[PDB]
Amino acid sequence: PHELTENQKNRRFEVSSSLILRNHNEPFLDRIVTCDEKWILYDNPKKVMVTIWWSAAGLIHYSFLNPGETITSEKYAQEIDEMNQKLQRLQLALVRRKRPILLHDNARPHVAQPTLQKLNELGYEVLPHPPYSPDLLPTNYHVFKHLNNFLQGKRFHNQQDAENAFQEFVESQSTDFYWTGINQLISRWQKCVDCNGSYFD
Amino acid sequence: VKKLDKWVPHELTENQKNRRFEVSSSLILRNHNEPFLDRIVTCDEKWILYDNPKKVMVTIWWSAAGLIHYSFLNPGETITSEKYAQEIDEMNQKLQRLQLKRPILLHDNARPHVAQPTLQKLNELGYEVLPHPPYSPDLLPTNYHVFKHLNNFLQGKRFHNQQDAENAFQEFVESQSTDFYWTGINQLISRWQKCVDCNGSYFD
Ligand SMILES: [Ca+2]
């Protein structure tokens, strides 16, 4: 946060380095499914949280919670289940399929037992992720970065208008938008290693 | 409390259990997706007592393939990150010579001497490191397997010389079959799975 501690930098360096090496030896970028949550303000209740799930192939699933509501582990487990059904439908026509790997952050609902049991049940390996590293999370450094630009200066009276604006943002992206975001992971891991685990931007 | 010679919470917090669960689950799944046990190199340190400074630290590195390298620190000498990095270089030279696949290191990264110089060295030499949850000697083969049997071998023995104590360690680790080390590693899957079955608690 305000300043990475020595240990926090070490953990970032460690994980980034291993992910680069792992990917070099056995490429896994195209198996990654990633996700995150964001508050969408009506003016930018009066807040609705969106969660979004995606891979290099494209958008997989997103859903809004009830206004003002925050996500729980039981509900994340539910979303995981919904996402996974949607994912299975997308892979329907692939000539060659391999199990997905989840990349998400250590948010507390993300790291609790109902969620973990669900990931284990569905067969999702979870990628190592060091704390305080939004700069290594593609939903944060890529999707939400661009969403913020898109939202900046808009107003909404209703949740409908907010959700509608979110859908327009989705519908507005190039087909390769997610693909590009995931491709960025390697240079970001490398930059982290290059800065000895500090932030780099 | 004391567990496999390491100190461990008398009762694991729910978060410490979630962490063990998460990593265990992901390692099982990873090994199913892309088996990697044959690539694992693992290591740890142990105090060897004598005149029983009166103790010398030994470091041991090994893989499913067998013993790779061990070394003794001087009595009264404490291991630093800078010296561990030097050890990794020596082990790596030995490993390269035996290999005549990309190694993955399983070790306890909470140890103090796993600081920047060590991490730089591992990256330099291209060692991937496996995720490992806190307070989990039961998931570290050097602890649950190698040192377990060593401890049984040392039971009831006294050494009055540093040399005698080192010779005993040497006798033990060097007399084991390669299959003895392989068994330690191939046991990991059953242990990750037990951890998952126990929802991240200890299981022995
Ligand atoms: Ca987040």
Side-chain angles (χ1 to χ4, degrees), chain A residues 1-96 98-201, chain B:
Chain A
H2 199 287
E3 188 179 44
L4 290 161
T5 68
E6 163 196 12
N7 185 66
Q8 291 172 346
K9 285 185 298 191
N10 281 167
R11 233 38 63 207
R12 287 168 48 84
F13 184 99
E14 183 186 284
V15 172
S16 292
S17 167
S18 285
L19 295 174
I20 295 169
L21 289 161
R22 176 176 176 177
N23 181 242
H24 179 253
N25 189 64
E26 24 177 56
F28 61 83
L29 290 191
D30 66 358
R31 293 170 55 209
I32 289 168
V33 169
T34 201
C35 73
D36 204 22
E37 299 79 46
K38 181 192 173 56
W39 289 111
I40 301 174
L41 308 170
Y42 290 26
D43 169 50
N44 59 62
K46 309 314 163 174
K47 290 184 310 177
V48 53
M49 173 167 282
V50 64
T51 90
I52 184 173
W53 302 73
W54 55 284
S55 64
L59 214 198
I60 294 155
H61 177 247
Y62 72 84
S63 73
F64 293 83
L65 281 59
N66 297 332
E69 189 52 53
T70 196
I71 196 159
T72 196
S73 193
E74 280 79 354
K75 173 57 181 173
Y76 196 67
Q78 272 191 275
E79 303 283 19
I80 288 172
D81 232 321
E82 302 193 42
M83 178 277 301
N84 187 58
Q85 292 297 110
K86 290 190 170 169
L87 181 58
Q88 296 185 150
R89 285 196 287 270
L90 297 179
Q91 318 194 82
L92 218 48
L94 282 54
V95 301
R96 155 210 173 64
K98 217 150 64 197
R99 268 174 298 221
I101 299 169
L102 185 63
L103 168 51
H104 72 343
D105 105 289
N106 305 111
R108 301 216 87 164
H110 289 190
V111 300
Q113 206 67 64
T115 286
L116 301 177
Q117 235 105 51
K118 175 68 62 180
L119 291 168
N120 179 66
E121 169 198 326
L122 297 177
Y124 280 72
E125 194 196 323
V126 180
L127 214 54
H129 181 72
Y132 309 107
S133 304
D135 57 334
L136 272 13
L137 294 167
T139 307
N140 297 288
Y141 72 67
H142 185 68
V143 179
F144 289 164
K145 159 171 85 192
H146 287 280
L147 177 64
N148 282 335
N149 287 350
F150 169 92
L151 278 179
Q152 153 197 317
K154 310 196 174 199
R155 295 174 42 193
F156 316 102
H157 314 309
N158 222 300
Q159 192 208 15
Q160 271 182 330
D161 293 288
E163 298 183 345
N164 280 352
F166 185 82
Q167 194 175 79
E168 179 193 340
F169 167 76
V170 169
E171 293 180 11
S172 200
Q173 302 316 312
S174 66
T175 58
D176 69 356
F177 173 76
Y178 307 98
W179 187 80
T180 301
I182 298 294
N183 280 347
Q184 283 184 48
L185 277 170
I186 300 168
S187 55
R188 286 173 174 273
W189 298 328
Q190 188 65 55
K191 279 184 168 167
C192 180
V193 166
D194 284 344
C195 293
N196 305 305
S198 296
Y199 295 130
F200 45 79
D201 61 11
Chain B
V1 70
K2 204 213 212 79
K3 181 174 176 80
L4 289 170
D5 276 358
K6 312 302 183 187
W7 258 263
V8 140
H10 174 286
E11 198 180 31
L12 288 163
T13 68
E14 192 57 49
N15 276 262
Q16 290 163 343
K17 292 184 165 193
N18 291 166
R19 227 323 216 208
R20 292 166 43 87
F21 188 101
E22 183 184 24
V23 177
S24 292
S25 179
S26 284
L27 294 172
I28 292 169
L29 287 166
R30 174 177 179 181
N31 188 244
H32 287 324
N33 290 336
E34 298 164 306
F36 63 82
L37 301 186
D38 63 329
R39 297 166 56 203
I40 291 175
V41 177
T42 194
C43 67
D44 193 23
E45 295 91 38
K46 183 176 172 49
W47 283 112
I48 297 197
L49 318 179
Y50 59 90
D51 186 19
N52 57 359
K54 186 261 180 172
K55 70 187 181 190
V56 54
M57 178 166 273
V58 63
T59 306
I60 183 172
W61 306 73
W62 56 281
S63 63
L67 186 55
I68 302 163
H69 171 246
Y70 59 90
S71 74
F72 302 94
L73 266 41
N74 290 334
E77 179 171 322
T78 199
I79 184 164
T80 61
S81 190
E82 297 72 13
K83 291 188 272 191
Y84 195 66
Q86 302 186 175
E87 274 279 289
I88 296 179
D89 253 330
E90 180 77 5
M91 171 278 293
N92 183 59
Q93 286 179 330
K94 292 191 182 176
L95 213 207
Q96 289 183 140
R97 296 201 291 273
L98 290 184
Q99 297 271 307
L100 296 180
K101 188 49 179 197
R102 310 280 295 136
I104 299 175
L105 181 59
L106 172 48
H107 77 329
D108 174 1
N109 77 343
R111 301 169 300 165
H113 47 96
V114 182
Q116 182 78 18
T118 294
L119 296 178
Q120 298 194 23
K121 183 57 72 172
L122 285 172
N123 182 74
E124 177 195 338
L125 292 182
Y127 280 72
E128 227 187 283
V129 178
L130 220 43
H132 181 70
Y135 303 120
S136 303
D138 53 344
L139 265 20
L140 295 167
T142 299
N143 296 117
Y144 73 68
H145 179 70
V146 175
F147 288 170
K148 179 176 85 171
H149 293 294
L150 169 63
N151 280 342
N152 292 349
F153 164 97
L154 292 173
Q155 190 158 20
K157 302 198 175 193
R158 307 161 206 82
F159 306 105
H160 310 305
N161 312 185
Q162 175 197 333
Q163 189 62 81
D164 289 337
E166 304 177 343
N167 293 359
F169 176 84
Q170 181 177 14
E171 180 179 347
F172 178 76
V173 292
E174 294 197 330
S175 69
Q176 304 311 317
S177 57
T178 52
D179 180 67
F180 166 86
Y181 294 103
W182 162 248
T183 296
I185 297 298
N186 101 270
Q187 254 198 278
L188 282 166
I189 299 194
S190 66
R191 284 180 174 264
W192 296 327
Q193 184 65 56
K194 195 52 159 176
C195 175
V196 163
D197 291 350
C198 298
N199 292 328
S201 323
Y202 295 132
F203 44 86
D204 63 9

